[PDB]
Write a protein that binds this DNA or RNA. Structure first.
Ligand SMILES: [Mg+2]
Ligand SMILES: [Mg+2]
Ligand SMILES: [Mg+2]
Ligand SMILES: [Mg+2]
Ligand SMILES: [Mg+2]
Ligand SMILES: [Mg+2]
Ligand SMILES: [Mg+2]
Ligand SMILES: [Mg+2]
Ligand SMILES: [Mg+2]
Ligand SMILES: [Mg+2]
Ligand SMILES: [Mg+2]
Ligand SMILES: [Mg+2]
Ligand SMILES: [Mg+2]
Ligand SMILES: [Mg+2]
Ligand SMILES: [Mg+2]
Ligand SMILES: [Mg+2]
Ligand SMILES: [Mg+2]
Ligand SMILES: [Mg+2]
Ligand SMILES: [Mg+2]
Ligand SMILES: [Mg+2]
Ligand SMILES: [Mg+2]
Ligand SMILES: [Mg+2]
Ligand SMILES: [Mg+2]
Ligand SMILES: [Mg+2]
Ligand SMILES: [Mg+2]
Ligand SMILES: [Mg+2]
Ligand SMILES: [Mg+2]
Ligand SMILES: [Mg+2]
Ligand SMILES: [Mg+2]
Ligand SMILES: [Mg+2]
Ligand SMILES: [Mg+2]
Ligand SMILES: [Mg+2]
Ligand SMILES: [Mg+2]
Ligand SMILES: [Mg+2]
Ligand SMILES: [Mg+2]
Ligand SMILES: [Mg+2]
Ligand SMILES: [Mg+2]
Ligand SMILES: [Mg+2]
Ligand SMILES: [Mg+2]
Ligand SMILES: [Mg+2]
Ligand SMILES: [Mg+2]
Ligand SMILES: [Mg+2]
Ligand SMILES: [Mg+2]
Ligand SMILES: [Mg+2]
Ligand SMILES: [Mg+2]
Ligand SMILES: [Mg+2]
Ligand SMILES: [Mg+2]
Ligand SMILES: [Mg+2]
Ligand SMILES: [Mg+2]
Ligand SMILES: [Mg+2]
Ligand SMILES: [Mg+2]
Lengths: 259, 134, 210
RNA sequence: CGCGACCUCAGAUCAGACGUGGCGACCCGCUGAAUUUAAGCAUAUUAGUCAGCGGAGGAGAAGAAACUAACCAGGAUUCCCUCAGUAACGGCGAGUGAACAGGGAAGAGCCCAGCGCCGAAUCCCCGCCCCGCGGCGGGGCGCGGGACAUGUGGCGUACGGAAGACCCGCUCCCCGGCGCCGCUCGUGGGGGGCCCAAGUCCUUCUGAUCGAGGCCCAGCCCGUGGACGGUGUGAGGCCGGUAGCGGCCCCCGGCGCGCCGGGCCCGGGUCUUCCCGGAGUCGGGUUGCUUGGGAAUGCAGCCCAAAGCGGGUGGUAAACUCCAUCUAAGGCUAAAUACCGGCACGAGACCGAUAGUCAACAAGUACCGUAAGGGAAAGUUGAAAAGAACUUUGAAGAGAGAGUUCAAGAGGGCGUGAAACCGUUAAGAGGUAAACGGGUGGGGUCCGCGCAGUCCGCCCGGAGGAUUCAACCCGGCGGCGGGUCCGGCCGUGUCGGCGGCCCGGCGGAUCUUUCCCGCGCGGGGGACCGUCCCCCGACCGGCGACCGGCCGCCGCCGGGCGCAUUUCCA
RNA sequence: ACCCACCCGACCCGUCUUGAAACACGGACCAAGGAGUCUAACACGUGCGCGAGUCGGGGGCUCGCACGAAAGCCGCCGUGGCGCAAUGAAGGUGAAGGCCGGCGCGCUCGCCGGCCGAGGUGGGAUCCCGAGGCCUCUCCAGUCCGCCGAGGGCGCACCACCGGCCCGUCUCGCCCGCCGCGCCGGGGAGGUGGAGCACGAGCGCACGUGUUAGGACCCGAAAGAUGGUGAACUAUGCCUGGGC
RNA sequence: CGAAAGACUAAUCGAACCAUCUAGUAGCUGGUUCCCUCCGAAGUUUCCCUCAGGAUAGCUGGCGCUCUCGCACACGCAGUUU
RNA sequence: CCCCGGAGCCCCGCGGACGCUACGCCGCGACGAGUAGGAGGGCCGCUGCGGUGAGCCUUGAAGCCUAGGGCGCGGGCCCGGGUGGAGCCGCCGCAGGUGCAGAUCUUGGUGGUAGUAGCAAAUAUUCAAACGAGAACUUUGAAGGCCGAAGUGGAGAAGGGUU
RNA sequence: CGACUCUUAGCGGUGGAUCACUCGGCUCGUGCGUCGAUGAAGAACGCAGCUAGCUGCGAGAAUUAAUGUGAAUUGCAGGACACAUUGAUCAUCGACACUUCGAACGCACUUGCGGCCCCGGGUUCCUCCCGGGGCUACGCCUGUCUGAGCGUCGCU
């Protein structure tokens, strides 16, 4: 809000001795705005409490290792189709969820051929769901250039630009990501970690040249290894039904002794 | 999407450039599609409408198959007046009900030299575009 | 009113600072403008290096740093005189020249002269006219290169020499370091006072003869 | 008794030019407080701040050291980070408060006076010829004028310079005109103009679709075009546009080539001889302002007033003595930099008509004050005025009909039309002002049953019916579990070939310059170490990382299964 | 849940206050607006990443910015901040001893070769050894599933104490070394001051609360300063007219 | 400016009016906007040109930690008494 | 002296929920006041944003009214009917100009007072006719009055600007 | 049953809150970065067929010419153009034009008084009068002309 808003008036307050109550009012005049009231958040016109400033701390910087950790968790939950269906991607005919396609995908230059590729990979139901979910936004965002909304669809990861960005361009839902330029805001939109992703061969082979394994460095970054698990075997059902614990466990007390 | 940062793509600004457009831009905004015979004969998708073009009304309460000549093109309200697209008032006088030219198809053009060179230029641009797409 | 064990703070917000807040929302656009100006300069000087002229080997002053090697303002005139390059020809060649720099040493002089000789060796000087005059280069060494050098030309690597592990003798084992440092401190403190004592002792020795 | 030169000063509606003033967001030179804080207040602080005055530019200013430092020394200025809330200042209280160095962005250097050498070799104006003459330029012809020795031009400026001597290899820069080929990166420089894909298909609601279903593959086509806006609703395909290394037609700009008129016979090193420095200025005393600058940081006023191996500086005043570093008292210069004014634009986790600018609207308008100045309120008919023809009462405002519209239960301040308040109708009540809480009772408006609602969900018995199949076998398919781990891939922990190590890259503050290249250095080789891999064999967990056979079990399909079995209606 | 009737209770809300229904203050009624926000410095607690390291500030390289003024990366991956070392005003100095043997008079002091390698006492969660007991359908022998374990330990963190070491200052005395034998330098023992060491714990981001500087939760003065506008009213002087 | 009343100086005079600093300051009045659950005070010590206010202890809330165990087997602590 | 694909049992050491959003469910025991203040939970409420509901909607969105059905201790919420005509909501997270009963609060509107106070300074009006739908105020005629030539008369200046 | 008063509901009035729309602000970012004596900013006054305000314009006064575009403007009349013709309207605008005050320029600010040339009426320059056209601001720069000086000198 502008600094001049509310203080362009010259309103000296009527003091004590009159029926008005101590508000800065407009000096003189035969106007409707004459002895009216300004210089307060409670007044018609005037300025508000706490004028919003340009020097608010708008931007947030995160640690680089935390950003790499979150993007590795997003790439790890790009697998595991229980996390992909709980995101909301229709998956029912997808043949293998780490969907790795040829290096001829970058060679396409036609959206008809891209739609045909999505139909043969049977991921077209997500785009169909985007077409079904194209509707109007609720609220005052329509007069703020935010008119229409839709779902996010199959995020396609490309290695080189040879026409894949021109091809998966008007098909609604597909976000394109470069291999070395992966974005957290597109790999986990809205904070939810799972996302249906379509890889290429030269992307699925270059992930190992980006982040490596646990016993190898990043080999494209300077100083970055993979993080370690806090616990390795997370199948605690199998852990607790293993005989090595139940040999040492005692007998329960489950007889409900009521009053 | 649009990639040119000089194209407007703004709600209130596009409404401003629409409702405050001058007359030669209003002429281009008030363009109407051609019939299938005219599209096959000229390879022209749409044309701006003139004072005496022949018109079928496509959508509205006055929908029909009657080929009506335009009375006059009123570019202030973005509308056209056709011959038989009229309505009786309370006092018995008939007033031509305006139709927006987007709901208007052209069946016959009124050809002069300017319209012939416009259609030749548009057919040449369609030929260049088809050769570039081929 | 300060209360219950905080820092005794002194904030400098007693002036009219809100009129003089310098917000930095310009700076990514400023990085874009600097990038566009740098690429326009690199397209302007098409065979020339994009960073600029060659910068000399320069050691830091102010004994805090005292070991780092920097890039300089320019090669000095004694360096140009030993290297055999005239000071008005070196600027046309692409060698940084400043007339302000002294040269009190010998090793930095010889290092900068060797850098100038290596740069004169690796530089390809194009002729003015297509009819090639003397002191030029061959058409083979006109066609074999047409690209720039992305980055600073001949980048200065602050490298240290590799030492050999020694077979330490009893002489170096019998050297005392802290005692030598304290004796050096005492001698630096009392070098002038003992000179005053020697002067007055010589004056008394002259007065004994007189 | 004058004339002619010079010097000082006038008059011109003399010939030709410049400045005045405005804006003022950013910048420069001044001037310059008080609110406030110090819980008072007086130094301090607010604060070189508001206000006031002048001046320009697209940036301004600064700027190539009379510098920083004390080090193995760096090297114009400006701007960002850090130094650093530090050194330092302060009724040492409140509070104030830099700089060097270092990492970056950008990087560009120079000209004078003096010292001197060249015949004033220099510059301005008017007459004539040639070129285009719309930011009046170039060459020549003039005992045509003037400025200028009280000093113009060339060489030349602290990084040294000049003149000779005589070694070296030798010949391209600029000005004014004319014409021509490449559209000249945001992927055609800038500006302007016109254009470039696909459904109004069929059915169906609506007042009207832009709604819904379908269209030989989710639907028919286009998509380097599914942004947006309009169109009677939510439109990729109705239209404008959108994307594009798409097209077409003019104007302007910087580049290269060729020709004419011209200006310039412009270098580097050794040696010989000369020269080289800005005065009421530095500096000293005093006074005031300022600064972090503290025995005075900077700037001014007065007084004194220089010197030349000199002078300035080296954060404590002074004397003596070695050093270290620059050359002040003359000037120019883009880039990195700032922009709440103006023009053209784009975007928004902003506001949505008491909000957001005072101003969404005839807003700095109406209006108020003598004036400086103060300064509003005020958006919405409908898709389209189709804005109610005509009859009738009233003078008319007003009505009653009729009409338009899906709707006036939208009727020219008209989208929806709350509360406070008022009118009418219906119901209830009424002398402790009205109103409320707890417990009830009565009367109303509506809701849920009900011509009995006894609601069924399983199992079993009986009398009525009935199509098939289960029980059990045959053939096929799919699934689960698994053994001596059956055979193979896969997979981890160890051992074997140290085998990949050169038929693998990297890194090293381990050696070797027995090596090579560019000149004691850097890179590529050579060993060494660490990190990642190849082949078969054994054991432990065959590990949910996979199959092909074998066995047990389950499910599905087609038959043989005719009726004491099997399942559905009552 | 709408209205009415009865019985009992029942003074009008907010605030200043020891005390409000108050003859204390604000208040006709209704609709809209309306008051703890934002930046910086800290302090503590919490969430996350890395860990004696941490962070990339600023800048540069990639995409022509729809989504973007996003994201990714850096022999700049550390120039620099904080921490890893403190103590003095400063010149400066700067955190380890113990066991065995030998040489000087073992002189509680000086000099040489190996080991443990960061002290000790008490209280200390967890862990180890653990005699023995409890049995089975019958007596003995007896590998094993076990539970309780009297008693003893190495003892995490943390607390109290005694020691030890570093720097500043004080007292008593001696010894060692030289390129310059000096107004040189270093060491011992014992007091005492420190925000110290005693085999690290910080850095970066985010959230909550509290203290501040800023308009600082909102509304409010009597004031002060700067720059302008008015002698059409009135106060006075002058000029020119009018009247009694 | 005042034949003097601090009178008049545009309904404004013991220092006019307009605009800005300025949203000047106030230990001084008034107000401070949803529900439920749990815990829950003080007007006292000392100091301050302090007496209508702060700082500091006290009272209070939250965040925790270190230990013990009605699972056959308790060291310590009190507005208490002996 | 046998196995429970079944001893058949108040317990099944053979796999083992109907009971398990383990941030869940269940079982005992004690307690429940509260200002200033502090803490926690909100599937209480407003606005906008990133995801999500093959979400809702002209076969009717938001808003508004309600003598209807209800739920929650409560903040509030879900339906039924009517008006309305075009957008809106639930969940996971993020953000704020996020909840009013007061401030002699700011703006706008409306009541009681109240059809009340008042339309009382300078003596005074009356009859007939014309116009009109309409006459106490207009006009005309007549009568009675007032200003009384320092006027309630006739003309200027300042000022107003078409009066 | 009354009248009046209170509550509730249906409906109708005052009123414009809520909601939904928005040719508008606010903020941030980019490119340019341009006023004026050849007359700036601002102000006054006039200009439409019917025209008050806003907007636009300047006695050529709702615009002139040229170019681009290509059949209108509009609230109602009217007339042009044949849109098979530089051609209606819009935009660009590079040509033309731009009343008065205003730095404001003959002196002041009443639109009052002038001076110097030229032309046309008066007249046949012979003086009045009228109209039209061009000059007349200050300070300063180079040069020209006229000069001044008991300022410095040569001849008499
Ligand atoms: Mg406002
Ligand atoms: Mg809403
Ligand atoms: Mg650089
Ligand atoms: Mg000026
Ligand atoms: Mg004070
Ligand atoms: Mg105070
Ligand atoms: Mg100022
Ligand atoms: Mg400059
Ligand atoms: Mg200088
Ligand atoms: Mg510097
Ligand atoms: Mg200061
Ligand atoms: Mg000279
Ligand atoms: Mg639309
Ligand atoms: Mg659309
Ligand atoms: Mg189209
Ligand atoms: Mg000062
Ligand atoms: Mg000295
Ligand atoms: Mg000193
Ligand atoms: Mg409004
Ligand atoms: Mg509204
Ligand atoms: Mg407003
Ligand atoms: Mg309104
Ligand atoms: Mg309305
Ligand atoms: Mg309706
Ligand atoms: Mg309506
Ligand atoms: Mg509306
Ligand atoms: Mg509407
Ligand atoms: Mg209405
Ligand atoms: Mg009080
Ligand atoms: Mg109290
Ligand atoms: Mg009292
Ligand atoms: Mg009370
Ligand atoms: Mg009382
Ligand atoms: Mg009071
Ligand atoms: Mg009252
Ligand atoms: Mg409200
Ligand atoms: Mg604190
Ligand atoms: Mg923390
Ligand atoms: Mg620091
Ligand atoms: Mg305030
Ligand atoms: Mg605050
Ligand atoms: Mg105030
Ligand atoms: Mg004062
Ligand atoms: Mg008195
Ligand atoms: Mg309680
Ligand atoms: Mg007080
Ligand atoms: Mg907001
Ligand atoms: Mg209210
Ligand atoms: Mg009365
Ligand atoms: Mg009266
Ligand atoms: Mg008269």
């Amino acid at each position: 809000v502008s600094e001049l808003a509310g203080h362009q008036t010259s309103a000296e307050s009527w003091g004590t001795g009159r029926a008005v109550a101590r508000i800065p009012r407009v000096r003189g005049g035969g106007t409707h705005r004459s002895g009216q009231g300004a210089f307060g958040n409670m007044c018609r016109g005037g300025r508000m409490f706490a004028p919003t400033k340009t020097w608010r701390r708008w931007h947030r910087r995160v640690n680089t290792t935390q950003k790499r950790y979150a993007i590795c968790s997003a790439l790890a939950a790009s697998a595991l189709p229980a996390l992909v269906m709980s995101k909301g991607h229709r998956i029912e005919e997808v043949p293998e969820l780490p969907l790795v396609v040829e290096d001829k995908v970058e060679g396409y230059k036609k959206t008809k051929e891209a739609v045909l590729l999505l139909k043969k990979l049977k991921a077209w139901n997500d785009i169909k769901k985007v077409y079904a979910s194209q509707r109007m936004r609720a609220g005052k965002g329509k007069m703020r250039n935010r008119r229409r909304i839709q779902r996010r669809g199959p995020c396609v990861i490309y290695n080189e630009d040879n026409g894949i960005v021109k091809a998966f361009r008007n098909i609604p839902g597909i976000t394109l990501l470069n291999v070395t330029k992966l974005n957290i805001l597109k790999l986990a939109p809205g904070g939810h970690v799972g996302r249906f992703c379509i890889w290429t061969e030269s992307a699925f082979r270059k992930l190992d040249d980006l982040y490596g394994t646990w016993r190898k460095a990043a080999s494209l970054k300077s100083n970055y290894n993979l993080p370690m698990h806090k616990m390795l075997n997370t199948d605690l059902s199998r852990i607790l039904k293993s005989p090595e614990i139940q040999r040492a466990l005692r007998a329960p007390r489950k007889k409900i002794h009521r009053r | 999407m649009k990639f040119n940062p000089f194209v407007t793509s703004d709600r209130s600004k596009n409404r401003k450039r629409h409702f405050n457009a001058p007359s030669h831009i209003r002429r281009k905004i008030m363009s109407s599609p051609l019939s299938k015979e005219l599209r096959q004969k000229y390879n022209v998708r749409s044309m701006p409408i003139r004072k005496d073009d022949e018109v079928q009304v496509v959508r509205g309460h006055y929908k029909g198959q009657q080929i009506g000549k335009v009375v006059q093109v009123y570019r202030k309200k973005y509308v056209i007046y056709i011959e038989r697209v009229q309505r009786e008032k309370a006092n018995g006088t008939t007033v031509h009900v305006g139709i927006h030219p987007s709901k208007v198809v052209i069946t016959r053009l009124k050809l002069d030299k300017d319209r012939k060179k416009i259609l030749e230029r548009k057919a040449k641009s369609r030929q260049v575009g088809k050769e570039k797409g081929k | 009113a300060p209360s219950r064990n905080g820092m005794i703070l002194k904030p400098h917000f007693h002036k009219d600072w809100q009129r003089r807040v310098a917000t930095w929302f310009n700076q990514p656009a400023r990085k874009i403008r600097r990038r566009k100006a740098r690429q326009a300069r690199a397209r302007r000087i098409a065979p020339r290096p994009a960073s600029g002229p060659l910068r000399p080997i320069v050691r830091c002053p102010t004994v805090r740093y005292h070991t780092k090697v920097r890039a300089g303002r320019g090669f000095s005139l004694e360096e140009l005189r030993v290297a055999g390059i005239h000071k008005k020809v070196a600027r046309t060649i692409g060698i940084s020249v400043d007339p302000r720099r002294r040269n009190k040493s010998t090793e930095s002089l010889q290092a900068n002269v060797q850098r100038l000789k290596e740069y004169r060796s690796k530089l390809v000087l194009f002729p003015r006219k297509p009819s090639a005059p003397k002191k030029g280069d061959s058409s083979a060494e006109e066609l074999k290169l047409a690209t720039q050098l992305t980055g600073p030309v001949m980048p200065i690597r602050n490298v240290f020499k590799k030492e050999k592990a020694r077979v330490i003798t009893e002489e170096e084992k019998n050297f005392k370091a802290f005692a030598s440092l304290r004796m050096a401190r005492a001698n630096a403190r009392l070098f002038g006072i003992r000179a005053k004592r020697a002067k007055e002792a010589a004056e008394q020795d002259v007065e004994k003869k007189k």
